[PDB]
């Protein structure tokens, strides 16, 4: 009755859950803006996903309050780079760390 674990590559936070849709992505962005963090968008090759430094999509959205524009920028990054993994981050300036970081598209 026991079932085996099927091994596969993972992508940090929220990678063990089913891939997020627009609603869940919007909820995460709303959380990020509610915590006072600055949303950011990054992308990199699948083979280079483990890189510490990803390609930055434009600049971090400082003071941005519209989750619709955040998601539109995510989709624009996906459209411009269709084979690249895309990550959404939230900069915490007080802690000099990231309050949230997860991939939106897992690449192909």
């Amino acid at each position: 009755e026991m079932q085996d674990y099927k091994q596969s590559l993972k992508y940090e936070t929220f990678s063990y859950l089913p891939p997020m849709n627009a609603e869940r992505i919007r909820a995460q962005i709303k959380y990020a803006i509610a915590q006072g963090w600055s949303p950011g968008i990054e992308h990199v090759e699948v083979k280079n996903s483990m890189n510490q430094y990803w390609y930055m999509w434009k600049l971090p959205f400082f003071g941005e309050q519209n989750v619709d524009n955040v998601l539109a920028e995510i989709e624009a990054c996906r459209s411009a780079y269709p084979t690249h993994q895309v990550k959404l981050v939230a900069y915490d300036n007080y802690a000099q760390s990231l309050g949230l970081a997860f991939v939106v598209y897992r690449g192909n």
Binding site: Y5, T13, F14, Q28, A95, S97
Partner: protein, 444 residues
């Protein structure tokens, strides 16, 4: 004895070391007398003035009791507040401060019990100690982990596993989804499993799991040794093989050894996990001992990236304030005084980085929403039984724990009351995770 070492009028300097002692005196003895007794025996140790006393500035080099307070709910005990000049201690020596405070006062025969409740470390003395080698934020940057608490596991049984079998437990635990695995406080180098073979096989398993998962992995390799030379050799071997984190027992191993290892870790870029073994012989008795909040301050002064603080959920709802208070002491930069949470002094840490909070002991998937709500993202959750007892294996248990963690974190981010809706959130996550579902079925 009275007028000499206790001054009600004395206003303590911002550089003074302040200590709060819960004195349970023998019936009939004077409260001010007992306060001056703790102050004297912790600073000078005598009252009879000898000819060598007159060669020194007696008004300066002495500890003074400046305030006595009633203990709420305990008429047989009172709080003694004592101020110590910063000049009385070696700069950057938690060992010397600890010795000066607790060397002889606990053997005082005129009190039935003595507890050291809180100690105020001034910023001037704080700036001298090295502190945590890396800190929470630097460790997060190094491990490339953000937005969720870290997951750990203690490899069990504590006895019997060879190097390869211990490695083949660690490998499945890590490849299942845990960020870290943990060497037990007992495992440093035993006849059934030598430390070098431990380090080699553990590094092999960690590298294999990291390659097969895509996430940075680690194991708190225990470097507690009979000798500092052996400890330094084990830490150097861990760095040579590439282990990103090691573990030390800072109480049984010793504060001097822990400070040296923390300085070495800061020098060599190796993360340090701290285990609090023996802490119960010291901090459990309510009327005699030194508090775990004081031990936490001492540990973060000495240096360490992780520290066991308790599971919080393991106590009743009305007994969580002291644990939360010492959690804030460990993690936050400035902790205001809070008598309800047991914080007796304003504690300014300046720029010293925080230390990750470790929750371990009898906790599984069901406690997890409460654990997330209480600890926040800056904590490490350890699942020994909750991972090894999984019917499908260590990898399946780790996957269940990771899925539950991610679901709870997302639920908290969405603005839901994760403690109120924990069962619903976990069930919704289990609709996509058979391992998680069978985990709740096992541990319900």
């Amino acid at each position: 004895y009275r007028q000499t070492y206790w001054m009600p009028e004395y206003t303590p300097l911002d550089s003074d070391i302040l200590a709060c002692f819960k004195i349970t005196p023998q019936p009939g003895v004077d409260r001010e007398e007992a306060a001056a007794a703790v102050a004297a025996e912790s600073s000078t140790g005598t009252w009879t003035t000898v000819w060598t006393d007159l060669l020194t500035d007696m008004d300066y080099y002495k500890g003074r009791a400046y305030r006595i307070e009633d203990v709420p709910g305990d008429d047989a005990a009172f709080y003694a507040f004592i101020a110590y000049p910063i000049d009385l201690f070696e700069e950057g020596s938690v060992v010397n401060v600890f010795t000066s405070l607790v060397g002889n006062v606990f053997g005082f025969k005129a009190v039935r019990g003595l507890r050291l409740e809180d100690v105020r470390f001034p910023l001037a003395y704080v700036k001298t100690c090295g502190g945590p080698p890396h800190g929470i934020q630097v460790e997060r940057d190094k491990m490339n982990k953000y937005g969720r608490p870290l997951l750990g596991c203690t490899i069990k049984p504590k006895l019997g596993l060879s190097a390869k079998n211990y490695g083949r437990a660690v490998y499945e635990c890590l490849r299942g989804g845990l960020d870290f695995t943990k060497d037990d406080e007992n495992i440093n180098s035993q006849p059934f499993m030598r430390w070098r073979d431990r380090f080699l096989f553990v590094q092999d398993a960690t590298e294999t799991a990291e390659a097969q998962t895509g996430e940075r992995k680690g194991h708190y390799l225990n470097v507690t040794a009979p000798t500092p030379e052996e400890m330094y050799k084990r830490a150097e071997f861990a760095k040579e093989i590439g282990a990103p984190i090691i573990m030390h027992d800072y109480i049984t191993g010793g504060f001097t050894a822990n400070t040296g290892l923390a300085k070495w870790c800061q020098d060599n870029g190796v993360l340090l996990h701290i285990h609090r073994a023996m802490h119960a012989v010291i901090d459990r008795n309510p009327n005699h001992g030194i508090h775990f909040r004081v031990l936490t301050k001492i540990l973060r002064l000495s240096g360490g990236d992780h520290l066991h603080t308790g599971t919080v959920v393991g106590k009743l709802e009305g007994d969580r304030a002291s644990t939360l208070g010492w959690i804030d002491l460990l993690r936050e930069s400035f902790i205001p005084e809070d008598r309800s949470r047991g914080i007796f002094f304003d504690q300014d840490w300046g720029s010293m980085p925080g230390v990750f909070a470790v929750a371990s002991g009898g906790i599984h998937v069901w406690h997890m929403p409460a654990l997330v709500n209480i600890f926040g993202d800056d904590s490490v959750l350890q699942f020994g039984g909750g991972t090894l007892g999984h019917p499908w294996g260590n990898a399946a248990g780790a996957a269940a724990n990771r899925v539950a963690l991610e679901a709870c974190v997302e639920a908290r981010n969405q603005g839901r009351d994760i403690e109120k809706e924990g069962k619903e959130i976990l069930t919704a996550a289990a609709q996509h995770s058979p391992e998680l579902k069978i985990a709740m079925e096992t541990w319900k």
